[PDB]
Symmetry: C3
Subunit: 402 residues, 3 copies
Amino acid sequence: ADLRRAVDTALSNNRSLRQALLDIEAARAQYRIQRADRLPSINANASGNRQRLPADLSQTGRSEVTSNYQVGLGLAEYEVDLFGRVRNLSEAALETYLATEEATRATQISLVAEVIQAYLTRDGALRRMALVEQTLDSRMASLELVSQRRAAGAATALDYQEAVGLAEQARAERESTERQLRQADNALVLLLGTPDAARLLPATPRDDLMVLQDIAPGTSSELIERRPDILASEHRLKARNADIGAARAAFFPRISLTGSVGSSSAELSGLFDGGSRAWSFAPTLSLPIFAGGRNRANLDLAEVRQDAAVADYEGTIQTAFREVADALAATDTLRREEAARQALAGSSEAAMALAKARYEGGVDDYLRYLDAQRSTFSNQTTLIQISTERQIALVDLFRSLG
Amino acid sequence: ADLRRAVDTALSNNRSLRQALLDIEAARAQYRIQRADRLPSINANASGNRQRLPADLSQTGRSEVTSNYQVGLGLAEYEVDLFGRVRNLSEAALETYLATEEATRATQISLVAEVIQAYLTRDGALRRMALVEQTLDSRMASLELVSQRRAAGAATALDYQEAVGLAEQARAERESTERQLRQADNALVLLLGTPDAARLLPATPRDDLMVLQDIAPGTSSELIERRPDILASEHRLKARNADIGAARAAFFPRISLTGSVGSSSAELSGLFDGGSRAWSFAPTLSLPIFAGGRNRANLDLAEVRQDAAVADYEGTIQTAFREVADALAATDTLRREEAARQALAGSSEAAMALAKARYEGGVDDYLRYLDAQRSTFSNQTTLIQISTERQIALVDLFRSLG
Amino acid sequence: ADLRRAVDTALSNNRSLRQALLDIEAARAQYRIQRADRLPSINANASGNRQRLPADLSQTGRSEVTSNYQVGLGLAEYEVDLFGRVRNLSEAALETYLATEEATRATQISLVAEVIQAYLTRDGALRRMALVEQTLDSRMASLELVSQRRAAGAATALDYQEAVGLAEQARAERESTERQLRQADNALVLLLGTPDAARLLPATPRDDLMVLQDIAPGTSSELIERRPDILASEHRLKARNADIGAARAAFFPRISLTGSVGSSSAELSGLFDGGSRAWSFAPTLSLPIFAGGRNRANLDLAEVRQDAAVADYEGTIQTAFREVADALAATDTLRREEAARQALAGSSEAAMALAKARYEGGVDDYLRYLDAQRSTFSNQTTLIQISTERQIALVDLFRSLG
């Protein structure tokens, strides 16, 4: 239940997710840039040229000095287009924007998966912490008992030394578990993206279900149709298929329309006088007759780039298939391994019960009961690593399934 | 023997290899693009300009409207070149294409080596599987015997619990080995690039030699001249050296010949009438007298980029040296370690013979024979990891040597 | 003491550091490129246009052939800038150069820390080598003693086999540690960047202090103000803020002054005769009245890019915070773990002393003394891995603190 709140908080506040959502807007703006090219551009132009072959003659100087002044609206090289290369560029930009949106969705799912993995690791670490703490308590109890026994002369110094060594060995394990727990907490605080993240997480471990234990993978086609990474690859392939059309349109003639409307005069004073309203119109037709490879090798570049995009799409499909196969195998194998470790923990607990019953009857010493404690507790914490790994494998399955 | 067939199949069908081979064609097409620039560009141009200072007057309107219409062939800004900057760009593109070819060769080698490594991992996993299966059988035999002994009262419940725990521990090892084997199979099917890869692999392990056990590394100079990544780095350095000449030629004057031949008239009706065949020739000589840093800082950019290219060449050489030295050290050390594990396995088998002889004589119980079975088999599988690591190290040495 | 010398040698000779220092010069050159745009550009221009409406007429042909030949100086489209978009791009290039300098500093620190870590790993490996060598010696002593005992019939063949197995196991550990030591030496020779690196290191490990043991992290704001990668991120954000100004200035009108001074004549012979000194001056005003999204969506692109840069800055801050937290936790935890392992080593040494005292008195056999040797030595080296990891964690803390 806390996972949904964590996911909502990440969606609200995560920084890389904000980066991806803004990249969506960036791709949208670039698509708008390319789409705006499809409409004619009109520009207000004010120009004045002053030229003469003799020298000096400035500010109404004494010569044949020519001056022209053109102010008005102008249609600047409107490409009237038989194929719509601009349209193909707009299509490529739109496909790029769609791919960016799909990549943002994939980043969102990846962030969710990372967060839940960190949470599961933290829970396992908390369980391990309680486990090793009580284990160290058991070790210290055994050390105290052995020290008291040698003080009475019933034990050699070798036994005291071995007890000390066992206690120190357990202490190192406790330190390692502390380091693991602190690193997990730091990873969670990094993932959540807020300085108050440590306040939003529960402080103690819980035995409740966190994520669904059994997931049906369905068919490979369903994985293909739902995973955002494959969708981004397909959209990128489509953008490349637009680029091939652009390079193909590069071959055909383009018609360009240059026009103007405004005023013209040889002197500034007559710039706004009656009868100065002028205009112009031109339709030029551009077609390199012989590319010499200049436009042909552009076609081969486009074709080869589209081929590389197709191969990238196939490779991403193969990577997705590998990921889902690995995740399914891990899920099944870790489920069975967790069953095995659960059986081991139950056997150790039964051994504890028998040792406790023997000791309370005065037949076995305190050392046997304490050692049973240590053994069953070590097995119970060893179960926890397998359980946490199974949960992380389930999360990896969920991610790799899209 | 199967390895050569796998290599041929990968060359025929691998997707990243197809990407690299297509990138070869892309670099070739780009080289053709840049080489086409060295030849004159002649384009067919048709233009019509209609302009006048008063307004209205459309479609032969009543004024001094000037209309000109020019249709013909035109040499569009042929840069006749005193230094051949275009030639330097063509050389840079050719060097880039050569570097792309070398990178494709390196990708081929990498894919091949990954294939052998995954295959060897699968073989080792199969051996480990047979091992742990029979080990688990041994554990069940011991558990059954201990259960039968407690049923008769000759064994305590503690012994039954320890037998159960050992059997459960062995089950976990079997599950881990199953996960490893399945992951190796998935890796192989990913690498081979075919859904029927699981049919192209033999289902059982073999003791036959797969790759040459003793390889002479030769000298480091031979490694430099044969490893494709160093060659790709050298070709990239050469392309940088060509871009140096490009930026250097950016300083010198360029001569640009614009030309045209076609028709021109004040009215459209006379466009194809006699006496309108016009021509034009215009050479321009371009040389910024004072760059102000505009052409100079380009020169510094080129020189500094060349220095960085030399540095990357040296770094790649150092990385290759590190890789080959590590591979040699690993080969020798894992050879000696495998010898050690072979000795351990032989000692365990001798203990097998002795324990079996003792048990068949009725001196030792079935537990001793079964425990010895477990021990010798655990040693035999522990040898297998070292052997597989040595084989993978040999494959890595092959990859590193080109 | 040797560490500062190693750092100095790396600064003098490292290749990636040379790459970064040269990238500083490259960024400086690009900044000079973009800054030189702020000044007017003058270019020597010589052109000759020969055109006429009929055909033939080459080399003073018989027609109305028009020839003009202009040689002189020309101010080519010098942009008079209302907003200084040129200034904004120069500022963006300057910020990029500053970011490159900071990134070079960060690369310097990273290379230093890598060198220190490799050196510490080599020291630990040397200690482990002496350790495992004497441990193997102990194993062979035990094997010889057990073989001599079986020759006399006082020991079974099973005991000889277990002794052989233990000796072979120890040999494998020796081989593994040899591989580790050789790989560490290879890493050092790669990092130092000189073929004579193996002559600059001590052949025997030392117990002296190498790096300071206690470091105060200070406050997070201090980490924000000193770590070079955060500085590079901030500088990149500033460069993005400058490109914001460039895209904003793209909206406003641009004045463009074109000018010329030189000679002009209808025939070549009069190119340098008196009375031909011509000049030209033109100030054009360019302002698209309706962007149509062409300039607006550029503004959106710039704003969204600036937002993405801000998010990148925040994410880099979070990454640095995570790194310093991990480093502090590791420092403390490995300090306490090293204390625990030191206590274990001391206990094992005391057990050694007691076992030697017993054996010299003729109470315990040689096997017990040899086993005490093996145990105390294994524990003493098990301390060494923790010590080396603590040193490496200190180095990581130094790197992550800038």
